[PDB]
């Protein structure tokens, strides 16, 4: 299962690219460079909620949903595991 630790990075990266592709062209979109785009992913998948970056495009919100479903699920497994791996040492 600890291979999700990849599904995430796949998602995160896909989320980045698509988010920008999606967002640019919309006047006032702050998600228009690939780096921020990544932090946005990470941000989203974890759902830390700093609210520093988010989509405005009808479409960008879609990439958001995908990053949420895929990323939350995904990131959820990476933790489930890391929780176990600790239960052992202790």
């Amino acid at each position: 299962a600890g291979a999700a630790t990849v599904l995430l990075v796949i998602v995160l990266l896909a989320g980045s690219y698509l988010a920008v592709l999606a967002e640019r062209g919309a006047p006032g979109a702050q998600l228009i460079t690939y780096p921020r785009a990544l932090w946005w992913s990470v941000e989203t998948a974890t759902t830390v909620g700093y609210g520093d970056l988010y989509p405005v495009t009808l479409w960008g919100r879609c990439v958001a949903v995908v990053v949420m479903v895929a990323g939350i699920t995904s990131f959820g497994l990476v933790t489930a595991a890391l929780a176990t791996w600790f239960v052992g040492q202790e």
Partner: antibody
Amino acid sequence: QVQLQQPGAELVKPGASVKLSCKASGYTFTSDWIHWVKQRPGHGLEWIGEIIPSYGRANYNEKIQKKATLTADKSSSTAFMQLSSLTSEDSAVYYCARERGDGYFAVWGAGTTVTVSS
Amino acid sequence: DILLTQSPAILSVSPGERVSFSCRASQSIGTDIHWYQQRTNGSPRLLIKYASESISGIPSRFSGSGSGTDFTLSINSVESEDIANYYCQQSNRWPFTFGSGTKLEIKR
């Protein structure tokens, strides 16, 4: 070596249209955006539009009147800006630049001087 | 869309002196401001990126400062080769925009 090659000049009669070019070289990625900037003599730089060849999508400056249509050609690494129905107003130097999707234009073209005259 | 105010339009400085060009944003843009140099008949040239980050191939004479809505491009000990037009450009919100421009001018 020089990264963006643009034709030094292009003459055009009012109402006519020219398709400028910009051939790349050096490093290339799927995150690259090629931009076009208009500059009339004396005045400053004016963003016209942008395109992502590794996908083909393009967005244009909504303030100015749309007189262009961007296209790219993956294989030859060449971006094309089609300017239609020109007037004295459209005469100026047009630069193409490469943006690594991080917001700034690292390298620029020599620019193509364009004149709209009979 | 974001407005980049570059004023004064012309700057007159004495050789070797320090000069400062200022760029003001119509709204906070963090540090997503970039500087370009353009000499008579040349093409623009990236000088500073992200407000302060340097660039290779550019004199250590050049530096940047600021965040939010107020930015400054500096030159320590100006000189003939520095006579040009300086522009600021932002990538905070779409679509990118440019400053009106500021012509440096040395008095000899």
